[PDB]
Amino acid sequence: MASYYEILDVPRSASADDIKKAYRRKALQWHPDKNPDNKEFAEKKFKEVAEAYEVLSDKHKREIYDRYGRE
């Protein structure tokens, strides 16, 4: 169970570098300069990519997500 394919931007296969870059690319993708009348979705995506990239990039955070998901 990685779920990264679903959560971020690309499948789990790309190195951690790409994970951070996928966050950045999506950040620009939903950045206010690139967003129309829908700001909620853009910020929502920015917020979820930030947290999701955060947990996957940090090995300790990943397990916290799993343990405190169940808890």
Side-chain angles (χ1 to χ4, degrees), residues 25-46:
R25 74 175 73 120
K26 181 171 295 301
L28 274 67
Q29 172 182 88
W30 295 93
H31 199 79
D33 81 292
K34 222 71 87 293
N35 99 275
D37 292 79
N38 291 274
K39 301 78 171 296
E40 192 284 301
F41 298 107
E43 60 178 72
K44 172 214 295 302
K45 283 308 183 176
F46 179 74

Side-chain angles (χ1 to χ4, degrees), residues 15-17 19 53-67:
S15 184
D17 307 81
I19 280 78
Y53 124 89
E54 182 187 289
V55 282
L56 186 70
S57 183
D58 193 286
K59 307 95 187 67
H60 187 247
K61 304 227 65 166
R62 307 207 314 108
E63 67 178 290
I64 299 298
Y65 195 80
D66 281 312
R67 65 207 287 160

